[PDB]
Design a protein around this ligand. Sequence first.
Ligand code: HEM
Length: 381
Amino acid sequence: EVIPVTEIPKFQSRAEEFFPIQWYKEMLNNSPVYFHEETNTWNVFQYEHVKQVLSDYEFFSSDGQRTTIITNLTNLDPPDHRKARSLLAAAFTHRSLKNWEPRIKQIAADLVEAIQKNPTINIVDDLSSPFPSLVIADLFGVPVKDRFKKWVDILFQEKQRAGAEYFQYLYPIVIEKRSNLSDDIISDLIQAEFDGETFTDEEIVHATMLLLGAGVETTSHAIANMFYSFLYDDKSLYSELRNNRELAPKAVEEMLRYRFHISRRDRTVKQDNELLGVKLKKGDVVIAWMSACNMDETMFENPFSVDIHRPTNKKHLTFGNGPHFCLGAPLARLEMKIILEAFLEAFSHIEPFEDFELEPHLTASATGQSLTYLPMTVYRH
Ligand code: HEM
């Protein structure tokens, strides 16, 4: 049973759903452990409850009958999760993340080089939408000619057709790489082994589709919302980053705490318990609202303000917590750092369009509402 999580807050505007800080403050102050009769869900907003739901799989299972949304990795609890996680993790080593940085830098340099003389840019079409698709295509090892945005657009049934077309495209590339191994994700998934078990070629195609669904639109949203913040939240932050070019990672971590909305994951209660202060029964569904708990003043001082120097920022739960903690988190942080650093090198100052209207430039997405357009005036020094 697909649970329509959109019906819990019932937002009055796309703009509110895009940045629901008023609703987070209401739930944290008045209703932090909230039973929603219409969806038959429990809803938790406080940092210590959200963290417990995400990680304590003995009590809060990822593999229940009801959900908020090809290996089903995200739907497995330990012990069955260990093999799937280990085989996919073979493509996300410390060595690969080190080797990816100069490749991702090249891609960012080319995207920014295309807009370097622009008086005005559109973050979405010029940067946030193409960049994570161009990156994942390079990291997969796709032929240079195919270097792909189309796929994830369509991968959003339209869905049956698109998945069958991706499969026919990639299946012969995996077979080819099995005989012709290179430093790319597909080659690392071919060589992966757990207790003598390996992926089949078909499983590797599915693994790449899971990585596309996990890592493209999420990263696009995170980048667009970071640039949104520089225009609309702390308008002095961009200047601070220009003045000290080592601050990019701190800025990325604060934009993942402050401007990624809405982050929520569901679990199914596995055993009766009152760990969240209320009696729950086996089969109950709990939604953990990570974006809300990222503004819990018990963990984050001055939580409704941008502060890239807040020493707790690295504790945000935008990537989850526990066994399912985002496999892509290092890559996501690297992509956001590299695109921000390339942008800072090109542009001395950015300004919003006085006439930009948010409501007409938001569309429904898996995370709530996403920018369709984000204009800015840019300057060079
Ligand atoms: C800003 C970007 C991203 C965000 C906000 C994000 C968020 C998340 C979250 C919250 C989970 C945990 C789900 C849960 O507990 O139920 C997760 C899992 C995962 N993410 Fe990410 N993600 C991002 C980028 C990426 C990228 C770039 C990749 C890969 C290229 C990726 C691959 C995955 C995978 C494979 C899992 C499943 C791990 C498991 O279930 O063991 N993600 N992501």
